[PDB]
Design a protein around this ligand. Structure first.
Ligand code: IQV
Ligand code: MG
Ligand code: ZN
Ligand code: ZN
Length: 312
């Protein structure tokens, strides 16, 4: 059969957590398929269906600065790295569902937060009162799966099909950062009282939730120049939302106010300390081989400290 292969540098580097998928948009589908093939098997999906699914997903990401098709592939690569470093811990359905979930997790994102849609009173905020964008992302995923010739899961049974869509749904909902805090606290407690048990479905669910937050936040786990340049795209969305808040007559939070550009280094610090570090710590406790994410995150915190001290 037809095995996708990548040039030597990418073949080697794609296995590392800190891999950057590069600026050549046209290689991103092949990179993703390569990942599916190695973490799942060349047999997981009908190549033609998979190819068709990928291109529809791509077409349904928008040309926004950060929440775009490059982000989808990036988050899916992080998941690939997690799965490859924890070979025996995941079921066949999970390996299948999770890369698709990551590719799909921000489908049709407009560059605006849940909180902005609520204040704008967007129709989606009446449809989905919490995790507004995320329930939309999963809705878009099902739509795409139901297009003619796009059903990459067609060869599973009815109940395996329902299980995989259930994995994907929960994984996608989990990318709502509002839900991460309590999820990580539960996980922390279960781990430390020794009650964490991966045969309990509701525990796996939590752990897969955490992996989703880890993959989603993985720009903070890259080489410093990648992390720093990604931060620009992130803030370009934040500030556009800030402007839109001002248009509705609402002072945005500082994160989103382009007049407070100076406080960015200090805002990154708060974020690494309140969100990122806790996230990769708990993940490393649960899944030891994901430690390089924690180590990379801490290096980047240290880089933001240097920026504040004027050394950078
Ligand atoms: C790197 C990153 N990846 C994902 C996500 C959701 N985030 N969120 C942040 C936010 C940082 C931040 N910046 C300011 C601020 C700026 N100027 N003044 C204050 N506050 N905060 C909280 N940063 C990230
Ligand atoms: Mg999202
Ligand atoms: Zn996001
Ligand atoms: Zn995302």
């Amino acid at each position: 059969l037809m095995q996708f292969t990548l040039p030597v540098r990418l073949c080697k580097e794609i296995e590392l957590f800190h891999f950057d998928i590069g600026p050549f948009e046209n290689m991103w589908p092949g990179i993703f398929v390569y990942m599916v093939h190695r973490s799942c098997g060349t047999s997981c999906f009908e190549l033609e269906k998979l190819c068709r699914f990928i291109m529809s997903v791509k077409k349904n990401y928008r040309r926004v600065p950060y929440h775009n098709w490059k982000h989808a592939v990036t988050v899916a690569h992080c998941m690939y790295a997690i799965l490859q470093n924890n070979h025996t811990l995941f079921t066949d359905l999970e390996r299948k569902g999770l890369l698709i979930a990551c590719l799909c997790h921000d489908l049709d994102h407009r560059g605006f937060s849940n909180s902005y849609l609520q204040k704008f009173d967007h129709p989606l905020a009446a449809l989905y009162s919490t995790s507004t964008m995320e329930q939309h992302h999963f809705s878009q995923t099902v739509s795409i799966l139901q297009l003619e010739g796009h059903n990459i899961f067609s060869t599973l049974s009815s109940s395996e099909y329902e299980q995989v869509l259930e994995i994907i749904r929960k994984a996608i909902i989990a990318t709502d950062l509002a839900l991460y805090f309590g999820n990580r606290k539960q996980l922390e407690e279960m781990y430390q009282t020794g009650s964490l048990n991966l045969n309990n479905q509701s525990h796996r669910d939590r752990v897969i939730g955490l992996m989703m937050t880890a993959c989603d936040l993985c720009s903070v786990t890259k080489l410093w120049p990648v992390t720093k340049l990604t931060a620009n795209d992130i803030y370009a969305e934040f500030w556009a939302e800030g402007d839109e808040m001002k248009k509705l007559g609402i002072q945005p939070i500082p994160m989103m106010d382009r007049d407070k550009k100076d406080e960015v280094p200090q805002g990154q610090l708060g974020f690494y300390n309140a969100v990122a570090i806790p996230c990769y710590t708990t993940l490393t406790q649960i899944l030891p081989p994901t430690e390089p994410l924690l180590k990379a995150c801490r290096d980047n915190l240290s880089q933001w400290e240097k920026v504040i001290r004027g050394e950078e």
